[PDB]
RNA sequence: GGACAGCUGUCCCUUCGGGGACAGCUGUCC
């Protein structure tokens, strides 16, 4: 039971990062690690700016973080 | 219900440099 957006932003972030000139790198500042679920504080860095994303759930963090980098990078 | 590791076999992608994937085996964990 969800909403439905389009697909994964990470792919398009890398596609645009390479097609344009931006180092698409995603990371976490707290929690996360090996046996875990990439979420909580997923931040994304790009060759121009950085984007923090406190995603707290399987539907946020990484997607929400990269999505913001996309919706913002799509403006500049 | 899943994220994250090595392996066995069969297999692919695209906005683009180049790449990877899916089941089984032992696992980290919640």
From Swiss-Prot:
Segments passing through the bilayer: none
Tissue expression remark: Polar granules at the posterior pole of the oocyte, and by the time the egg is laid, at the anterior pole.
Effect of residue 36 to A: Abolishes RNA binding without altering the conformation of the domain
Residues that, per the record, bind RNA: 36, 38, 58-59, 62
Compartmental location: Cytoplasm, Cytoplasmic ribonucleoprotein granule
Domain DRBM positions: 8-75
Domain of life assignment: Eukaryota
Domain notes: Contains a proline-rich domain. The insertion of this domain in the DRBM 2 domain is required for stau-oskar mRNA localization. DRBM 3 domain binds optimally to stem-loops containing 12 bp (in vitro).
Subunit structure as annotated in this protein's UniProt entry: Component of neuronal ribonucleoprotein complexes (RNPs) that contains at least various translational repressor and mRNA turnover proteins such as me31B, tral, Upf1, AGO2 and sometimes Fmr1.
Function in brief: RNA-binding protein which forms ribonucleoprotein complexes (RNPs) that play critical roles in the localization, translational repression and turnover of RNAs during embryogenesis, neurotransmission and neurogenesis. In the oocyte, essential for the localization of both the osk/oskar mRNA to the posterior pole and bcd/bicoid RNA to the anterior pole, and is therefore required for the correct anterior-posterior patterning of the developing embryo. Association with osk or bcd at their respective poles, appears to promote the formation and stabilization of the ribonucleoprotein complexes.
Name under which the protein is recorded: Maternal effect protein staufen
Organism: Drosophila melanogaster
Gene that encodes it: stau
Complete-protein stretch covered: 571 to 646 of 1026
């Amino acid at each position: 039971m969800d909403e439905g957006d389009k697909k994964s932003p990470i792919s398009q972030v890398h596609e645009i990062g390479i097609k344009r000139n931006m180092t698409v790198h995603f990371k976490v500042l707290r929690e996360e690690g090996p046996a875990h679920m990439k979420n909580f504080i997923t931040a994304c860095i790009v060759g121009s700016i950085v984007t923090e994303g406190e995603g707290n759930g399987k539907k946020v963090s990484k997607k929400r973080a990269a999505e913001k980098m996309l919706v913002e990078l799509q403006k500049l």
